[PDB]
Paper text:
We found that the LFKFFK segment from PSMα3, identified as fibril-forming by computational methods and which indeed forms fibrils, shows dose-dependent antibacterial activity against Gram-positive Micrococcus luteus and Staphylococcus hominis, but is nontoxic to S. aureus, the secreting bacterium. We obtained two atomic resolution structures of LFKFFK; both revealed a departure from cross-β fibrils and atypical amyloid architectures. The second polymorph was composed of out-of-register β-sheets, meaning that unlike in canonical cross-β fibrils, β-strands are not perpendicular to the fibril axis. The second polymorph, featuring out-of-register β-sheets, shows intermediate quantitative measures of amyloid stability, consistent with the previous suggestion that this mating configuration could be associated to the transient nature of amyloid oligomers. The second polymorph of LFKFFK is composed of out-of-register β-sheets, a morphology that was also suggested to serve as a pathway to toxic amyloid aggregates, and the interface between the sheets is reminiscent of the KLVFFA segment of amyloid-β42. Thus, the two different polymorphs of the antibacterial peptide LFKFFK display features which, in human disease-associated amyloids, correlate with toxicity. We correspondingly suggest that atypical fibrils of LFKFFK encode toxicity to bacteria, while the reversible fibril formation provides means to regulate activity. By not representing a spine that recapitulates the properties of the full-length PSMα3, the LFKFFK segment exemplifies how an array of activities can be derived from a single polypeptide, through generation of shorter derivatives with different structural properties.
High expression of PSMαs, which are four peptides of about 20-residues in length, increases virulence potential of methicillin-resistant S. aureus (MRSA). Amyloid aggregation plays roles in PSM activities in S. aureus. In the present study, we investigated the structure-function relationships of PSMαs and their short truncations.
Numbering used by the authors:
A (entry chain B), B (entry chain A), C (entry chain B), D (entry chain A), E (entry chain B), F (entry chain A), ...: 1 to 6
Write the structure that this text describes.
């Protein structure tokens, strides 16, 4: 599971 | 801006 | 899932 | 401006 | 889904 | 001016 | 769907 | 002037 | 659909 | 002057 | 930023 | 098991 | 940062 | 059994 | 840091 | 039996 | 550090 | 039987 | 028939 | 820039 | 028909 | 930059 | 149809 | 940088 | 379709 | 650095 | 698809 | 350093 | 998939 | 020093 | 998989 | 000095 | 597996 | 001096 | 396995 | 002086 923000 | 969850 | 804004 | 969700 | 404005 | 949703 | 004005 | 919706 | 004026 | 709708 | 659990 | 952040 | 248990 | 952190 | 029991 | 820490 | 019993 | 520490 | 460029 | 035909 | 570049 | 056709 | 680069 | 098509 | 590099 | 496609 | 290096 | 793919 | 060296 | 793969 | 030297 | 694998 | 020299 | 393996 | 000289 | 093995 992951969260990614740019 | 980008927010990506998986 | 994602949100993208430009 | 662009807002794109998928 | 998206919204685009110019 | 242009507004485009899809 | 769109609206366009010139 | 022009207004165009579709 | 459109409206055009000159 | 011209007004044209379609 | 990235947060990744597995 | 793990948590990873960047 | 990384935390890993096994 | 172990715990590892970086 | 690492803690390992066996 | 053992415990190990680094 | 290491503690080892047998 | 023994105990060992380092 | 109508052809409109702008 | 645009071309429009009806 | 409509072709719009910007 | 974009191209749009309807 | 829509092609949008940015 | 991105390319978007609909 | 969407291709996004950053 | 990343590449994202949808 | 997503490829992320850091 | 890391590589991540989804 | 994830490959992480430190 | 370490290598980690998931 | 994890390989850790210290 | 040590090597650890999981 | 663990190999520890001191 | 010692060598330890698990 | 353990080998200890002193 | 001694040697010890387990
Ligand atoms: Na999530
Ligand atoms: Na969403
Ligand atoms: Na919409
Ligand atoms: Na409309
Ligand atoms: Na009308
Ligand atoms: Na977890
Ligand atoms: Na544990
Ligand atoms: Na123990
Ligand atoms: Na004992
Ligand atoms: Na033109
Ligand atoms: Na263009
Ligand atoms: Na581009
Ligand atoms: Na890139
Ligand atoms: Na890298
Ligand atoms: Na390394
Ligand atoms: Na070593
Ligand atoms: Na030694
Ligand atoms: Na000796």
């Amino acid at each position: 599971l992951f969260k990614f923000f740019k």
